[PDB]
Structure 1
Amino acid sequence: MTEYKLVVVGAGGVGKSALTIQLIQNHFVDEFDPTIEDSYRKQVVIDGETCLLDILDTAGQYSAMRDQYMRTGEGFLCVFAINNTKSFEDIHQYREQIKRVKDSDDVPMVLVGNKCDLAARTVESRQAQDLARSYGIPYIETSAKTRQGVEDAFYTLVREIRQH
């Protein structure tokens, strides 16, 4: 069937692994031993259509391996956490690097603000909505913990790949 290659990127500790596992296994894991991090495949139904998601959950930081997953990846979730200002400031660098390897300022992407279940917010929604608008991509707030917005974020990325 149709297979969509999705890649999850962003700074250390924003929730890349928890987000991926929440989508794949429908629960919240508190910690991961990066015995690779790596790749998962899932059959899902999106807009009536059944299809295959191949999701790579990346490390925060081999240049050729990084460039390699950026080049083969079809869509990207760019994750920060709403309680970590530094993670939001790093977003620019992840997006720039993807655009530079793919040779396109039109790569399918969704800006993800994770940990929205938390009280100690340091990044306002309006700031992140502005950044996303500046890139011309959607913004979605998520919580891997409560599952808020998780399906929306991944499913929106797939649609962005189709609408490309």
Structure 2
Amino acid sequence: MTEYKLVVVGAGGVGKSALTIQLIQNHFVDEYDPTIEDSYRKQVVIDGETCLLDILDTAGQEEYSAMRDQYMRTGEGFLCVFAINNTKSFEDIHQYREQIKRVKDSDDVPMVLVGNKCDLAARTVESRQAQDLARSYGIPYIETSAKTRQGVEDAFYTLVREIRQH
């Protein structure tokens, strides 16, 4: 069957693991548990197509650095995740974007910009500024909450549809 190799990237603590576990296992994890590298494989049906989601959940820390090159080369699409209450994670998106473009030798890679933790009232990144950034990259912007499950299937399925139209 068709397999889609998705990679979730972004700064430490933005909720990359919580979004992936909400999608795969249907629950919100709320504890401190830094990722090294986890993969999840799940057979699903998306718009009637039977497929397998092979998802790589990555570390937010640069002990990795050029160690990111390997997984970026094999990833077909990327969720670029920041937290709406963390301005530094939003500014860090530019560095993941440029690294992915450089390892894949391409200016248009299937990618979705995801603003997570949208359940929080202490917002520091306005949706309008993230939407402007996404518009300049030519990619979709989706807001999510791994805590309420808002936007979670939407972010992953929009990324599968982006790979489909590449």
Give the TM interval when normalised to the shorter protein: over 0.9
Farther-moved stretch of structure 1 (24-33 vs 102-111): 24-33
**Residue 83 of structure 1 aligns to a residue in which SS?**
coil
d(CA) in 2 for partners of 1:11, 1:35: 11
In the alignment, which residue of structure 2 is the partner of 1:143?
145
Q: Which runs of 5+ in 1 are unaligned?
A: none
d(CA) in 2 for partners of 1:139, 1:4: 20
Contact in 2 for aligned 1:114/1:144 (Cα 8 Å): yes
Task: State the aligned residue count.
Answer: 164
> C-alpha displacement at 1:33, in angstroms?
3.2
TM-score by length of 1: 0.96
Farther-moved stretch of structure 1 (22-31 vs 147-156): 22-31
Q: Relative to structure 1, is the Cα distance of residues 79 and 35 closer, same or farther in structure 2, using a 3 angstrom cutoff?
A: closer
Q: Which runs of 5+ in 2 are unaligned?
A: none
Farther-moved stretch of structure 1 (36-45 vs 153-162): 36-45
RMSD: 1.2
Provide, for residues 131-164 of structure 1, a one-character-per-residue CA deviation record: whole Å limited to 9, x for no partner.
0010000000000000000000000000000001
Farther-moved stretch of structure 1 (24-33 vs 60-69): 60-69
Q: Relative to structure 1, is the Cα distance of residues 119 and 161 closer, same or farther in structure 2, using a 3 angstrom cutoff?
A: same
Q: Relative to structure 1, is the Cα distance of residues 136 and 34 closer, same or farther in structure 2, using a 3 angstrom cutoff?
A: same
TM-score by length of 2: 0.95
Provide, for residues 5-43 of structure 1, a one-character-per-residue CA deviation record: whole Å limited to 9, x for no partner.
000000010000101111111111112534744100011
Contact in 2 for aligned 1:17/1:37 (Cα 8 Å): no
Provide, for residues 86-117 of structure 1, a one-character-per-residue CA deviation record: whole Å limited to 9, x for no partner.
10000000000000000001100000000000
Contact in 2 for aligned 1:39/1:54 (Cα 8 Å): yes
Farther-moved stretch of structure 1 (105-114 vs 62-71): 62-71
